[model samples]
Target: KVFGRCELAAAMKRHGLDNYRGYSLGNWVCAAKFESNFNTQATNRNTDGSTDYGILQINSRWWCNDGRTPGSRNLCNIPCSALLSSDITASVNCAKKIVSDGNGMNAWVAWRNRCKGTDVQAWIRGCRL
Candidate 1:
């Protein structure tokens, strides 16, 4: 799903946003580059039957059906082609929920690189974090 730009941008557009808050393609690439090397279809053992996938490392199958909302059809399934094709915001949101409340990108990179995003307001303030 390296070409998930369309889907990611579309989600922000639908939400009246123009970007991925608290993160960026570069920031995301940091973790993915080190963790799974940008593999959106990645998964591993979780003791249970669950697995991890997607750029932000989402285990959406359990999330989309968490009695909170009616799940979509892309959970646990790869984006398939050139686009995310799933609940884009939901997927990112789910990753934030599980990883670091949307701070995984900054935290992961920071913990490893000893620095966070050069910009910080882009996420909630639209100041280009």
Candidate 2:
């Protein structure tokens, strides 16, 4: 599913992303925009043979197991395929775990480059919160 900006915001908020770990909802929304363009089925293969999956592009290197990444920790304890589902609960939960582990939003390069140190509220400007 390719979500509209407001739709993505609402979904993340419902899953407790709003103000999660001191990062605003906009940070999450903005990161998703750059990472996956709001598409649930998005996937990106990295040079190291790991793959990024789902709306937030969780990586196979340390997060999810894809049976292909060489030394994946599978810290999220889920199959990478789970991240591709239109039902984003697993993706959202995995993302929260990433942040909760002290990685912060910088776990995603897209977030560091596009959302960090920026006023990201515009990403959810028209969302009804």
Model 1, C-alpha of 73: deviation from truth (Å): 15
For model 1, which pairs clash? 119-129, 122-129
Residue 74, candidate 1: C-alpha displacement in angstroms: 12
What local lDDT does model 2 show for residue 34?
A: 93
Residue pairs in collision within model 2: none
Candidate 1, 1-129: lDDT as tens digits: 443433444344454333356444444434444544444554443455444444444543443332222243444233422113344454455555444443344444322562253442222232232
Q: Please provide, for model 2 over 1-129, each residue's C-alpha lDDT reduced to its tens digit, 9 standing for 90 to 100.
A: 999999989989999999998988999999999999999999889899999999999989899999999988999999999999998899999999998887878888998898888889999997787
Q: TM-score for every candidate vs. truth?
A: 0.38, 0.96
Candidate 2 has what TM-score? 0.96
**lDDT (C-alpha, whole model) for all candidates:** 0.41, 0.92
Candidate 1: worst-modelled 10 consecutive residues by lDDT = 120-129
